[PDB]
Design a binder for these strands. Structure first.
Length: 51
RNA sequence: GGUUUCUCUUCAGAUCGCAUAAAUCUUUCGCCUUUUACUAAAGAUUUCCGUGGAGAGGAACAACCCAAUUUUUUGAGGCCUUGCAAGGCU
């Protein structure tokens, strides 16, 4: 045997199944940095005048 | 009692081998009509060219000097009192 067609195999390959068909994605970062600047109103998301 | 040299069995931990091949399978890659033959990395399992320890049998070559301080060549023996022991003695 020679592994001649390894991307196109008779089944779904392991990497292909992970990336497209419901394998576990690594999912590393989640909302790493989402902080409003201190000078901004939380409701308006714009610089406050009367804090 | 020894050494050398062949065959077989068994166990291999040691860089088993200051050397280094191939095959099979699974992952990823490169080739791109299909299959041989392949490109190159990881992991797993075998084969092959060699090696070490132990045991058994065969054959060949050799042989049944301190006595003078610090130790071991003596300060060694004798008397008195009390309940051999202690002390005083010579």
């Amino acid at each position: 045997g020679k592994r001649q067609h390894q991307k196109d195999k008779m089944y779904i390959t392991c990497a292909e199944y992970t990336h497209f068909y419901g394998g576990k994605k690594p999912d590393l970062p989640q909302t790493n940095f989402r902080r409003l600047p201190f000078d901004h109103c939380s409701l308006s998301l714009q610089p406050f005048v009367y804090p």
